[PDB]
Amino acid sequence: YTFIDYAIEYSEKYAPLRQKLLSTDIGSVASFLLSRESRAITGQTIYVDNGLNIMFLPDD
Amino acid sequence: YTFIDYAIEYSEKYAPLRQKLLSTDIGSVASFLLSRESRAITGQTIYVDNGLNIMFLPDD
Amino acid sequence: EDICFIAGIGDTNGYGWGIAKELSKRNVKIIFGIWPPVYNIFMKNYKNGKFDNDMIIDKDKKMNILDMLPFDASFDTANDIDEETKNNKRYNMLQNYTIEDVANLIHQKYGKINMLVHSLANAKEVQKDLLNTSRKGYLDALSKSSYSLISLCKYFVNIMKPQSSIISLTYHASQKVVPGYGGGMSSAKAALESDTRVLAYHLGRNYNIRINTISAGPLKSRAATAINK
Amino acid sequence: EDICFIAGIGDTNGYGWGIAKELSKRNVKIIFGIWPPVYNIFMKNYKNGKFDNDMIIDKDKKMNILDMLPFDASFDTANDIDEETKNNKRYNMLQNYTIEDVANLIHQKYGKINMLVHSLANAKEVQKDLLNTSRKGYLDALSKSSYSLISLCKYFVNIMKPQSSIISLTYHASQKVVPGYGGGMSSAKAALESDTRVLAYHLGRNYNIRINTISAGPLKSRAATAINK
Ligand SMILES: NC(=O)c1ccc[n+]([C@@H]2O[C@H](COP(=O)([O-])OP(=O)(O)OC[C@H]3O[C@@H](n4cnc5c(N)ncnc54)[C@H](O)[C@@H]3O)[C@@H](O)[C@H]2O)c1
Ligand SMILES: NC(=O)c1ccc[n+]([C@@H]2O[C@H](COP(=O)([O-])OP(=O)(O)OC[C@H]3O[C@@H](n4cnc5c(N)ncnc54)[C@H](O)[C@@H]3O)[C@@H](O)[C@H]2O)c1
Ligand SMILES: Oc1ccc2cc(Oc3ccc(Cl)cc3O)ccc2c1
Ligand SMILES: Oc1ccc2cc(Oc3ccc(Cl)cc3O)ccc2c1
């Protein structure tokens, strides 16, 4: 049922935070990185994925 | 002249961003992570060091 | 007066829109860069109020779009437009849609900006696995999805103020293998993330400008639906 | 009402103070967790107005400190306190300074909080390179600098509201070698970063709580000087 539906399904079941990822979640992070508030951050890859990236083996 | 003076001087000469790192610089980022504005970020190590960590070989 | 150019918007279902919505929440003027092939269809949907609800900023505010310009990240300058695209129905009634032209266009109408967002990707062969992706497809993916960021910076840095900031979107596929994310997208994202570091050095030392990239999770956007796997 | 507990503040020259200052910019009540050895010196100075300037938040705002409590991150509960420190000239007259005691203390006076900052580190043998650090000094570094975070989480998770956030400070010496960062501090930061991930899993799944760690650059704090190398 399409690649994206698998990823979203997997992300909502195995990520540390089991919540729906909204485009505005990335939006608020973008907004912060674009402001002077983050003057000391540069050349970084910030993960905004409910933490899925830290998992290795899934629970179920 | 101590380790910290070497660390600071080296950071202000080779970091992608040449400027003094203030305790408030980390403070503003810590503020973002502690608020709901970062609801989708967790289990991460965010670098606030003017980008120093991305360097390998110093310029001169 | 913060001005932000968001390159890579064709609708309200992607991240670019989520980014614009959150920015205007903080009163920053937004300029959209729309891919020519869907520019008129976008303006049409915009004019008939199809995005009206999508523009209501939580706090009862209305999202303020300064301008919407046709923009194609695969063309650096005017003399880069080939006759095939030069005659295409979608690009005919449009002009000044190259990275350099829109940079000048924006500078001329609104002056210097201080925020830039790269939120676009393109891979003709995303449906084929890396092994069967062709050289033409692979390079097309890098050209449109990776190099486009470098060209944006090179040309836009001239119309940006010191201490400006730039971001782009990437996917973890560049670091760990995700079957289905083919055609060189993974390669392009890997180049994007590395280029971000290198560009951070140059833009940081020469202009005191910052650049970072966000590695987002899955979002059922229009382009996402495309990836059939 | 946002309430943040900052563990690790003995002066205004550290990161804890910079974090506190910035938080008060957003109007969050700050609760300080001071190490007993420097508690009296801190209070004495605070009261004698030796930090009045340091408490000025640009917009005239006066940093609002809700409470100041003695806190020792090496003791989980009251029966973990050995007699020697129990009767130490600096601790003897204080009470409820263990991790579990400050959680209950904060809970009984202010109720549930929603922000926790781990801003402390400690290594007796920091002056010795990793190769020549003793098992005792090494374990002491991991106990104070790393475990303290896990223990803070275990006890504070019951006084924290859902969707609360936790952060700690780390240093790049955990990933790359910096000679001079001894005593097992590099080891402690490696563990801390790793534990931040494992905890993000347990806290996220069970309590809807987030936890991240900030890898900061060099700051000439009081402790930074202890690194005689
Ligand atoms: N959706 C996700 O699950 C996901 C996850 C992580 C990262 N990303 C990244 O987010 C970014 C935006 O993607 P999205 O998923 O929101 O989808 P999206 O479909 O809204 O965005 C892609 C846009 O790029 C534009 N485009 C293609 N070629 C172009 C060109 N030559 N010039 C200008 N515009 C061009 C298209 O008009 C389209 O609107 C991409 O970089 C993508 O890789 C997305
Ligand atoms: N200053 C830097 O250059 C630098 C760089 C990167 C990371 N960090 C991190 O920042 C954090 C704070 O350090 P800082 O450098 O701002 O210095 P700091 O001297 O203000 O912080 C250390 C504090 O921890 C407290 N402490 C020690 N043992 C304790 C215990 N058992 N219980 C409770 N408190 C105890 C001390 O009172 C002291 O105030 C540390 O975790 C450190 O690793 C600092
Ligand atoms: O021609 C193409 C092919 C694929 C694409 C994927 C995109 O964004 C993503 C969608 C989903 C995921 Cl999991 C990652 C992405 O980068 C964006 C544009 C694309 C254009
Ligand atoms: O007993 C000790 C010994 C060393 C310490 C170093 C600290 O913070 C840092 C200071 C400078 C740098 Cl570069 C990194 C740090 O983690 C903080 C507390 C410490 C306590």
The single-letter DSSP state of residue D27 is T
Q: Which domain holds residue C98?
A: 1-229
- Nearest ligand to residue C228 Cα: 3
How many C-beta atoms lie closer than 10 Å to residue C228's C-beta? 10
Interface of C with A in 108-147 (CB under 8 A): 115, 117
Q: Which domain holds residue B16?
A: 1-60
Amino acid sitting at position C107? H
How many C-beta atoms lie closer than 10 Å to residue D173's C-beta? 20
Q: Do chains A and C touch (3 or more CB pairs under 8 A)?
A: yes
Closest CA to D69 of D113, D123, D25, D27: D113
In the block, residue with structure tokens 């275990």? D154
Looking at the 3D structure of chain D, how many domains does it have?
1
What is the domain-level CATH number for residue B35?
A: 1.10.8.400
Whether the CB of A18 is below 8 Å from some CB of chain D: the reply is yes
How many C-beta atoms lie closer than 10 Å to residue D78's C-beta? 13
Give dist(CA C31, CA C13) in Å, integer.
Answer: 17
The single-letter DSSP state of residue D144 is I
> Residue of the nearest CA to atom 14 in ligand 1?
C14
Is C46 part of the annotated catalytic residue set? no
Gap positions in chain A, given as the residue before each gap (C–N > 2.5 A)?
A: none
Question: H or E segment at C67?
Answer: strand C65-70
Closest CA of chain C from B2, distance in Å:
27
DSSP-H helix ranges across B1-43: 3-14, 23-34
D173 annotated among ligand-binding-site residues:
no
Contacts of D195 in chain A (CB under 8 A): none
Whether the CB of A13 is below 8 Å from some CB of chain D: the reply is no
List of long-range contacts for D127-131, beta carbons under 8 Å, 24+ apart: D127/D182, D127/D183, D127/D226, D127/D227, D127/D228, D127/D229, D128/D182, D128/D183, D129/D179, D129/D182, D130/D182, D130/D184, D130/D186, D130/D187
User: What phi, psi does C14 have (nearest 5°)?
Assistant: -105, -175
Looking at the 3D structure of chain A, how many domains does it have?
1
> Residue of the nearest CA to atom 14 in ligand 3?
C171
Q: Which residues of C71-108 are buried (b: 16+ CB within 10 A; e: fewer)?
A: bbbbbbeeeebeeebeeeebbeebeebbbbbbbebbee
Question: H or E segment at C165?
Answer: strand C160-170
Closest CA of chain C from A59, distance in Å:
19
How many C-beta atoms lie closer than 10 Å to residue D156's C-beta? 23
Give dist(CA D183, CA D131) in Å, integer.
Answer: 9
Q: Which residues of C117-127 are buried (b: 16+ CB within 10 A; e: fewer)?
A: bbbbbbbbbbb
Grouping H, G, I as helix, E, B as strand and the rest as coil, residue C86 is helix
Select the residue from B29, B54, B57, B60 to test the C interface by mutation, using most C Cβ atoms within 10 A.
B54
What is the domain-level CATH number for residue C109?
A: 3.40.50.720
Select the residue from D175, D205, D206 to test the A interface by mutation, using most A Cβ atoms within 10 A.
D205
Closest CA to C192 of C135, C137, C144, C124: C144
Q: Report CA-CA distances (Å) from A14 to A3, A11, D145.
A: 17, 6, 30
User: What phi, psi does D30 have (nearest 5°)?
Assistant: -105, 130
Whether the CA torsion D56, A41, C20, A5 is positive or negative: it is negative
